[PDB]
Curated annotation (Swiss-Prot):
Recorded topology in the membrane: Peripheral membrane protein
Keyword terms of this UniProt record: Aminopeptidase, Cell inner membrane, Cell membrane, Hydrolase, Membrane, Metal-binding, Metalloprotease, Protease, Zinc
Cofactor(s) required for function per UniProt: Zn(2+)
Cofactor: how and how many bound: Binds 1 zinc ion per subunit.
UniProt-annotated catalytic positions: 295 (proton acceptor)
GO terms, biological process: proteolysis
Family designation: Belongs to the peptidase M1 family.
Site residues, Transition state stabilizer: 378
Lineage: Bacteria, Pseudomonadati, Pseudomonadota, Gammaproteobacteria, Enterobacterales
Source species: Escherichia coli (strain K12)
Pfam family, one: Peptidase_M1
Record-given protein name: Aminopeptidase N
Gene name of the record: pepN
Subcellular localization, as worded in the UniProt entry: Cell inner membrane
């Protein structure tokens, strides 16, 4: 029942706050906050100051040290009337970190106290202008028990400290950069601290401090290393240096999201900090690197230039995601990064864009802004930034970055400001391109071709449309950069030209329908279309199998080779799902299996690329091939396809598995790539002849000298239901039960198991010694993984998965609505399923709609879903 807010309602605030002096008298049960703000009236003389506040106990209100009588509290607010044009506001209020189970505001993480203020959490700390176009200079004094909280941290530099009576002490911090309150942070606790330094290119020496729970210093150096790598890369690639003297990171165990870019004092979920080779996989290492980079990158794209309002979230997030992908891609394998980001787009983001929650990357309407930290705003947002990069090229794109910062450094900006900077600096016209900000849904691009041997011309007829979405009945054509390459019979690229002039290979597809003609095409080409996934679109082209296997062999970009393989598999995934619905077993032409045999035996192919080709689309990517999802058929077909390839390629699989053995473990990209290939081979081998598979898998688990290899073996034992499974699963538990992060991997394998009794096991794990409903990571690794990553069990025909999720959400709605709203997502996809499943999913949603004290977070999603 809160009301929707609308982007078109934006208005400049009636009051600004320029400076705020905060004091916290910290205690888990009762913290007392004193906030002295210097305010200035911009609006009308008679306009009251309206402060946001949630669950605060107001103690006093003074204006220039006069106790104020002209105020009132209303729902979510303190409204203060009859004010001068400039004045000092002082508010004292109380809060209770220990009661804060939602983990928004000031809360408790184990024995630590920490904050999360984005999007609107600072209002849970004191009454404030909790909107990101109000930027203020903060000073923060923190008073606490010295033994319990020996480290008292906030943004910026320490400027004062003292000791008090009765075992208390205090520290005061000042951050010279004006900031919106969402970037405020405070941490209090007892930590081990890893300290290091980075010297910027101009010579600024930056102290780096990573704070971790006592005992975890053995797991901190990789995050420190990645922080230095991120700082170096931002200098080399974007020309950006860190702007303060200290960079602090705190790893906390209780955190709803991944991490948070609070200026000078980032707060991280420990999953994105803590690694050592026996606890963390290669993928953990690269996610640490990604996320460390991402928060660092926000220092410019988010902090030095922030968001005018929350509808502009993608201005920081699309651009910072783009930056983290570029970082990862530059340091590591660009092809593997691009592949993975495309898998995410097509299999997860396209599903959101086809859901009741569909929105443009710059939303128009929001009820609960924490619901809009989405695949769309992030991943599609980054694809839009990448399109700009495609249209401008690197040099002009960097000119646009520089112009963006020159204009907006020190302020809150809009998506439109950013696009204008890019357009003005490059002289590329982005007026049509802007529609990508305002239109939801995934465009479908249909391509037909014609080769004319009399004129040696090749013609592409390209059409686009975006189907209506629930949020938008009106859709219009976009400016779609559509990259192509044309290949002759020997696999060489044909120069693109027309009328004697070269033609850019990025075509501008701007109309509902258009034709493009290329001259001097001396041989009928095989096209590579939408190269490097040049726009976030569904491609419709009538490929032959042979065109696709030809691209798998000859395409110049590794991405195109993988993508061609995906298009080849899509045909046969669809075929086999229809078969499955008719009771018929898997059918695959011999020449398809041969294409994958060729990948395995090709000596020149990068193993990173080979590994991706040999990784089948996930059940989520497979679901996107279909209008109506049959999750049981998809799961069974994926397995049958794995078993068919395991049998047909058994000898080649074992040979490549053995050839990529590595005795040394290194977190190095060539090594990672070999190991990904070897483990991609193991997945198939696990589905071969049982006794061979069992031996191979058990052996890898017991001989692994690193968690990447041990987990790959354990996961294969679960997936193929091998005899060794229960023993290996018990061993892992017995060894790792005290380590939450490591047990998350195990809860995911339990939740995603193909066993017939998976729900009964998942329910039993609610009582496991390593599980707790108080920890978001545990919740997501057991309950989220079941609902979101085991659609076949979640969607069991008896409706048991939906009932289970309802029960869990009934708890989480009151305990932690943000995590609840993450976990409801699979139920809101009901219209993609068959009538009988829809009926049960609607019944489940209607039960949740009637919960007493329904959170705004759930209410928004439930009302869209039931419409
Ligand atoms: Na201000
Ligand atoms: Na001040
Ligand atoms: Na309130
Ligand atoms: Na690279
Ligand atoms: Na054709
Ligand atoms: Na054709
Ligand atoms: Na437990
Ligand atoms: Zn971010």
């Amino acid at each position: 029942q809160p009301q929707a807010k609308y982007r078109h309602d934006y208005r400049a605030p009636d009051y600004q706050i320029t400076d705020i002096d905060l004091t916290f008298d910290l205690d888990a049960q009762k913290t007392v906050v004193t906030a002295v703000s210097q305010a200035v009236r911009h609006g009308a003389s008679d306009a009251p100051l309206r402060l946001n506040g949630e669950d605060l106990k107001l103690v006093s209100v003074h204006i220039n040290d006069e106790p104020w009588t002209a105020w009132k509290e209303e729902e979510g607010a303190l409204v203060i009337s009859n004010l001068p044009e400039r004045f000092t506001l002082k508010i004292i209020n109380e809060i209770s970190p220990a009661a804060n189970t939602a983990l928004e505001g000031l809360y408790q993480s184990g024995d630590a106290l920490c904050t999360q203020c984005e999007a609107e959490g600072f209002r849970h700390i004191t009454y404030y202008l909790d909107r990101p176009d109000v930027l203020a200079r903060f000073t923060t004094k923190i008073i606490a028990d010295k033994i319990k909280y020996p480290f008292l941290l906030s943004n910026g530099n320490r400027v004062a400290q003292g000791e008090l009576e009765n075992g208390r002490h205090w520290v005061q911090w000042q951050d010279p950069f004006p900031k919106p309150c969402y970037l405020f942070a405070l941490v209090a606790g007892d930590f081990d601290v890893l300290r290091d330094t980075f010297t910027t290119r101009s010579g600024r020496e930056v102290a780096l401090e990573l704070y971790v729970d006592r005992g975890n210093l053995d797991r901190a150096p990789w995050a420190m290393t990645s922080l230095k790598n991120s700082m170096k890369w931002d200098e080399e690639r974007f020309g950006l240096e860190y702007d303060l003297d200290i960079y602090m990171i705190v790893a906390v165990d209780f955190f709803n999201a991944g991490a948070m870019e609070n200026k000078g004092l980032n707060i991280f979920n420990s999953k994105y900090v803590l690694a050592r080779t026996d606890t963390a996989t290669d993928k953990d290492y690269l996610d640490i690197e990604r996320v460390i980079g991402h928060e660092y990158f926000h220092n410019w794209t988010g902090n030095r230039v922030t968001c005018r309002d929350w509808f502009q979230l993608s201005l920081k997030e699309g651009l910072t995601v783009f930056r983290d992908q570029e970082f990862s891609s530059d340091l590591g394998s660009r092809a593997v990064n691009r592949i993975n980001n495309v898998r995410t787009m097509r299999g997860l983001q396209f599903a959101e864009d086809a859901s009741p929650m569909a929105h443009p990357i710059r939303p128009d309407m929001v009820i609960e802004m924490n619901n809009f930290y989405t695949l769309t705003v992030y991943e599609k947002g980054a694809e839009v930034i990448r399109m700009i990069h495609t249209l401008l090229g690197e040099e002009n794109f960097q000119k646009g970055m520089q112009l963006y910062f020159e204009r907006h450094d020190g302020s809150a900006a809009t998506c439109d400001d950013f696009v204008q900077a890019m357009e003005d600096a490059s002289n590329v016209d982005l007026s049509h391109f802007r529609r990508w900000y305002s239109q939801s849904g995934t465009p479908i691009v249909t391509v037909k071709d014609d080769y004319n041997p009399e004129t040696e011309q090749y013609t592409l007829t390209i059409s686009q449309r975006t189907p209506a979405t629930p949020d938008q009945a009106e859709k219009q054509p976009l400016h779609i950069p559509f990259a192509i390459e044309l290949y002759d019979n020997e696999g060489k690229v044909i120069p693109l030209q027309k009328g004697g002039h070269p033609v850019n290979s990025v075509l501008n597809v701007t109309q509902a329908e258009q034709t493009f003609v290329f001259d001097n095409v001396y041989f009928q080409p095989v096209p590579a279309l939408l190269c490097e996934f040049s726009a976030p679109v569904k491609l419709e082209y009538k490929w032959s199998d042979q065109q696709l296997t030809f691209l798998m062999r000859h395409a110049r970009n590794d991405f195109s080779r993988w993508d061609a393989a995906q298009s080849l598999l899509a045909t046969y995934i669809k075929l086999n799902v229809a078969r499955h619905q008719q009771g018929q077993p898997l059918s695959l032409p011999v020449h398809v299996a041969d294409a994958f045999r060729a990948v395995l035996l090709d000596e020149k192919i990068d193993p990173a690329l080979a590994a991706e080709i040999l990784t089948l689309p996930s059940v989520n990517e497979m679901a996107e091939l279909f209008d109506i999802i049959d999750p049981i058929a998809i799961a069974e077909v994926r397995e049958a396809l794995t078993r068919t390839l395991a049998t047909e390629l058994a000898d080649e699989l074992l040979a490549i598995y053995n050839a990529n053995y590595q005795s040394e473990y290194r977190v190095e990209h060539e090594d990672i790539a070999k190991r990904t290939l070897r483990n991609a081979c193991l997945r198939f081998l696990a589905f071969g002849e049982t006794h061979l598979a069992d031996v191979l898998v058990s052996k890898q688990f017991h001989e692994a000298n690193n968690m990447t290899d041990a987990l790959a073996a354990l996961s294969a034992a679960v997936a193929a239901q091998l005899p060794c499974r229960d023993a290996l699963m018990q061993e892992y538990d017995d060894k790792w039960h005290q380590n939450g992060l490591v047990m998350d991997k195990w809860f995911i394998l339990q939740a995603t198991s193909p066993a017939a009794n998976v729900l009964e096991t998942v329910r039993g794990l609610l009582q496991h010694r390593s599980f707790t409903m108080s920890n978001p990571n545990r919740i997501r690794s057991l309950i989220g993984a079941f609902a979101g990553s085991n659609p076949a069990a979640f969607h069991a025909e008896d409706g048991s998965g939906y009932l289970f999720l309802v029960e869990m959400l009934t708890d989480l709605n009151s305990r932690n609505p943000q995590v609840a709203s993450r976990l409801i997502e699979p139920l809101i996809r009901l219209k993609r399923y068959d009538a009988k499943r829809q009926e049960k999913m609607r019944a489940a949603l209607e039960q949740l709609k009637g919960l007493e004290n329904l959170s705004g977070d759930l209410y928004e999603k439930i009302t869209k879903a039931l419409a």
